[PDB]
Amino acid sequence: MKKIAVFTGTRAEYGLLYWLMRDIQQDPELELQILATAMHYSPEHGETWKTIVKDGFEITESVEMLLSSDTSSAVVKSMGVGLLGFADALKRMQPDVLVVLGDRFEALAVTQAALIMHVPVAHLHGGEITEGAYDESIRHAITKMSNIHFAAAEEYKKRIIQLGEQPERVFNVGALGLDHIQRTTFKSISELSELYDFDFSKPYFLITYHPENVAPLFDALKQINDVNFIFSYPNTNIVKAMLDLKAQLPDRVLLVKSFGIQNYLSVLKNALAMVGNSSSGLSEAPALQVPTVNIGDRQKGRLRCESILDVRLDENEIVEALQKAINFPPLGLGNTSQKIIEVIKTTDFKKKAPFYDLL
Amino acid sequence: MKKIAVFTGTRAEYGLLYWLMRDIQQDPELELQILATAMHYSPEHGETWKTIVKDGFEITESVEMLLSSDTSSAVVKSMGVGLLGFADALKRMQPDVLVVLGDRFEALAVTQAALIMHVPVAHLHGGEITEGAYDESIRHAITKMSNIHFAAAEEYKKRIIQLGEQPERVFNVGALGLDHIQRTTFKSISELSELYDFDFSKPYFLITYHPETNLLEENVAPLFDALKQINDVNFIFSYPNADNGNTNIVKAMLDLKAQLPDRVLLVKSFGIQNYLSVLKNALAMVGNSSSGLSEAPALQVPTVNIGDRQKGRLRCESILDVRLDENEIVEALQKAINFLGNTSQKIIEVIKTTDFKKKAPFYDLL
Numbered sequence: 006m007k008k009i010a011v012f013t014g015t016r017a018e019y020g021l022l023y024w025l026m027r028d029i030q031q032d033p034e035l036e037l038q039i040l041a042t043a044m045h046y047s048p049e050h051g052e053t054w055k056t057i058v059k060d061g062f063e064i065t066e067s068v069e070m071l072l073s074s075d076t077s078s079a080v081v082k083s084m085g086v087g088l089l090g091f092a093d094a095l096k097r098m099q100p101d102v103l104v105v106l107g108d109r110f111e112a113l114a115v116t117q118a119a120l121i122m123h124v125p126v127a128h129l130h131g132g133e134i135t136e137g138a139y140d141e142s143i144r145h146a147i148t149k150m151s152n153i154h155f156a157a158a159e160e161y162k163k164r165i166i167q168l169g170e171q172p173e174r175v176f177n178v179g180a181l182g183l184d185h186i187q188r189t190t191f192k193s194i195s196e197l198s199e200l201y202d203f204d205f206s207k208p209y210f211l212i213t214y215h216p217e218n219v220a221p222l223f224d225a226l227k228q229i230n231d232v233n234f235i236f237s238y239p240n241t242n243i244v245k246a247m248l249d250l251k252a253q254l255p256d257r258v259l260l261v262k263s264f265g266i267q268n269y270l271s272v273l274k275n276a277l278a279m280v281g282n283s284s285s286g287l288s289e290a291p292a293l294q295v296p297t298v299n300i301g302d303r304q305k306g307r308l309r310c311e312s313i314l315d316v317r318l319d320e321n322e323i324v325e326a327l328q329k330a331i332n333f334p335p336l337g338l339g340n341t342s343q344k345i346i347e348v349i350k351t352t353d354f355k356k357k358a359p360f361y362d363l364l
Numbered sequence: 365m366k367k368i369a370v371f372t373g374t375r376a377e378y379g380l381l382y383w384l385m386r387d388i389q390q391d392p393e394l395e396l397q398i399l400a401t402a403m404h405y406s407p408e409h410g411e412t413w414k415t416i417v418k419d420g421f422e423i424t425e426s427v428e429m430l431l432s433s434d435t436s437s438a439v440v441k442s443m444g445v446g447l448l449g450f451a452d453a454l455k456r457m458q459p460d461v462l463v464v465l466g467d468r469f470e471a472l473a474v475t476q477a478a479l480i481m482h483v484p485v486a487h488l489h490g491g492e493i494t495e496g497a498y499d500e501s502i503r504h505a506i507t508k509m510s511n512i513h514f515a516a517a518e519e520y521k522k523r524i525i526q527l528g529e530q531p532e533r534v535f536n537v538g539a540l541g542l543d544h545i546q547r548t549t550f551k552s553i554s555e556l557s558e559l560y561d562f563d564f565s566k567p568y569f570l571i572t573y574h575p576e577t578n579l580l581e582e583n584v585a586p587l588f589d590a591l592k593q594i595n596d597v598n599f600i601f602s603y604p605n606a607d608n609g610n611t612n613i614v615k616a617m618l619d620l621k622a623q624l625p626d627r628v629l630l631v632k633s634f635g636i637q638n639y640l641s642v643l644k645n646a647l648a649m650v651g652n653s654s655s656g657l658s659e660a661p662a663l664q665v666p667t668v669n670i671g672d673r674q675k676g677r678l679r680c681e682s683i684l685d686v687r688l689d690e691n692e693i694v695e696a697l698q699k700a701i702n703f704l705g706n707t708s709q710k711i712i713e714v715i716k717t718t719d720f721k722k723k724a725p726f727y728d729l730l
């Protein structure tokens with residue numbers, strides 16, 4: 006029996022890790038541990054650790070860490086509280102593997118804690134490029150302190166190998182979140198229509214825009230005749246906009262508070278195009294044959310493919326892309342969890358492999 | 365007037381950083397800040413902050429962090445205490461740059477603290493390899509979180525560039541500590557003997573052994589037994605660092621001291637002037653410290669390097685690599701018996717003439 010602990014610090018990355026957790030839990034020779042922390046214990050986002058429990062999981066260790074503040078000083082303090090809790094949490098859990106996804110500072114924290122305490126780290130989504138204040142640097146630091154690496158694409162695996170990781174320790178397995186696409190039983194147009202009191206049978210745009218003046222977006226959709234607009238929630242700067250557009254056209258736009266992964270993929274499935282700058286637009290929309298118009302550069306650095314139509318944040322260049330989207334796989338198909346588990350079962354990665362020099 | 369804050373966690377790195385610190389203090393266009401922490405405030409490692417102050421430097425911010433419990437979980441907790449202190453220290457200092465040397469866990473802590481608080485990091489001694497310690501992965505993580513890089517050799521600079529750092533931010537300026545060869549006057553055998561009440565005129569090994577932190581079950585008896593098998597030489601020890609697993613080494617050192625009181629000198633921490641004075645006259649530098657492969661060859665003193673803590677570093681012909689094995693150590697010892705300094709100024713003018721306020725993009729190799 007191998008103890009596989011999954012680290013989770015936000016609702017979104019828990020969503021991405023969901024099916025790997027389900028598979029470990031189901032697998033009889035693998036014991037699932039869960040270390041939940043950071044924004045799962047934030048009242049701003051409704052204590053999303055409860056969602057983990059409601060989905061059938063047992064939170065093995067929980068570590069409140071986030072300070073109620075907006076300063077970066079308080080982010081450093083939050084990271085310190087995190088390290089203090091992670092020491093005792095890893096001490097009690099004694100995982101054989103710690104699964105860490107992404108590049109948030111609490112994942113950096115737990116990764117270095119694991120390194121010091123000799124818990125092997127399996128890192129997901131290393132080798133990626135997504136410019137920010139410093140999210141990139143942190144991602145690569147996590148890569149350097151991890152023992153095995155599950156990249157989502159070949160460019161990413163190659164960049165991980167350039168970072169000095171042994172090729173036998175890097176695996177292109179696809180994007181784990183896309184397992185949802187492969188395992189969801191989608192709601193029909195009738196079911197979605199009855200559930201949200203809205204006729205999804207008249208085609209629509211699904212639009213998730215996240216805050217990076219968003220005017221040349223909401224002036225860019227008023228022009229598009231004869232389409233309904235289903236929004237998810239991204240904030241008052243854009244929420245106020247979305248609401249203004251609602252009141253102007255009270256019927257042919259629907260704003261939904263929280264879709265949920267199943268309903269969300271069902272509405273995204275039956276859409277002409279995913280509009281906006283969310284990450285859904287650069288992985289889930291391609292896997293669901295629905296074109297994407299990505300706005301601005303919040304998703305700058307992610308790999309592209311046929312379906313992606315990137316346009317700057319101005320009115321005209323958007324209004325063109327919408328119609329062009331009314332005029333019609335590197336991250337994989339969605340069996341990533343099983344590939345990850347097969348590699349974990351068949352590979353020794355207890356120790357950090359020797360640094361890999363190119364040549 | 366640019367604010368250059370120098371981070372210092374241990375004696376070792378402080379001595380390495382000395383001439384850079386003194387040159388910034390002396391340079392009237394740069395304001396020296398110092399963030400001292402970790403082993404500088406532990407009585408078990410000498411309270412070496414006193415050395416910093418006595419050298420004429422002002423400790424702008426101090427952060428005690430080291431937990432006394434000798435476990436890996438206590439090391440993690442020490443790093444967390446570090447972060448909680450560095451938050452306020454860096455908040456007040458508002459440095460224009462933070463200078464971080466090396467690969468220890470407190471340096472990882474302060475580097476991520478500075479990154480999160482948008483304080484550019486100048487990292488010294490990146491691109492090297494020390495496979496036997498978790499300092500290895502720490503070092504590459506610190507490289508990825510640093511803005512400008514000062515390496516000690518072209519091989520190391522090249523490894524920094526492979527790590528995805530922009531070429532114009534990686535500089536080969538040499539090892540800063542070796543500036544002590546030209547600018548620091550060495551003590552003589554008589555002054556060392558009066559200063560430590562121990563005769564340095566008799567042949568002696570200088571021994572420094574730290575926990576090899578990737579080794580699962582470190583048992584250091586083969587070294588000390590090996591030392592006991594030698595005749596007519598003295599054993600002068602510095603203390604192991606604060607990594608988990610050091611109290612075992614301290615225990616073995618105290619056992620050896622009680623066994624051979626007239627032949628053993630245990631010093632928690634020398635001044636680096638004193639330390640280089642002792643190393644220069646030793647029969648050999650025994651142990652697994654980084655001085656065995658930079659300072660010790662530079663002073664023409666043979667090195668007996670034990671284990672894998674220094675595995676991967678550049679070698680030369682006076683480096684004797686052995687396993688943690690009684691016979692290999694005894695024989696390397698029997699052999700040992702029987703038988704350019706402008707780095708600081710280069711770093712300073714690079715920091716003066718370069719803009720590294722923002723992390724440069726990831727450098728993909730062709």
Ligand SMILES: O=c1ccn([C@@H]2O[C@H](COP(=O)(O)OP(=O)(O)O)[C@@H](O)[C@H]2O)c(=O)[nH]1
Nearest residue numbers: 017215237262263264265266269283284285
């Ligand atoms: O009402 C909603 C809106 C979004 N999502 C999910 O939230 C995830 C993250 O969305 P987004 O791309 O906006 O995150 P970001 O890219 O901004 O980090 C996606 O996988 C969606 O499936 C959801 O479950 N319900």
Ligand SMILES: O=c1ccn([C@@H]2O[C@H](COP(=O)(O)OP(=O)(O)O)[C@@H](O)[C@H]2O)c(=O)[nH]1
Nearest residue numbers: 375376379602633634636639653654655659
């Ligand atoms: O008692 C000592 C021992 C070390 N040093 C300095 O620290 C460096 C490295 O020694 P140490 O074992 O403490 O560090 P590490 O092996 O971890 O690099 C040497 O080159 C010396 O310049 C010192 O000043 N006093």
Ligand SMILES: CC(=O)N[C@@H]1[C@@H](O)[C@H](O)[C@@H](CO)O[C@H]1O
Nearest residue numbers: 376377466467489490492503654
């Ligand atoms: C700082 C110090 O005292 N010792 C060494 C230093 O010589 C070396 O270059 C560095 C590698 O990053 O690792 C430190 O442990």
Ligand SMILES: [Li+]
Nearest residue numbers: 029030032035
């Ligand atoms: Li299971």
Ligand SMILES: [Li+]
Nearest residue numbers: 388389391394
């Ligand atoms: Li000065």
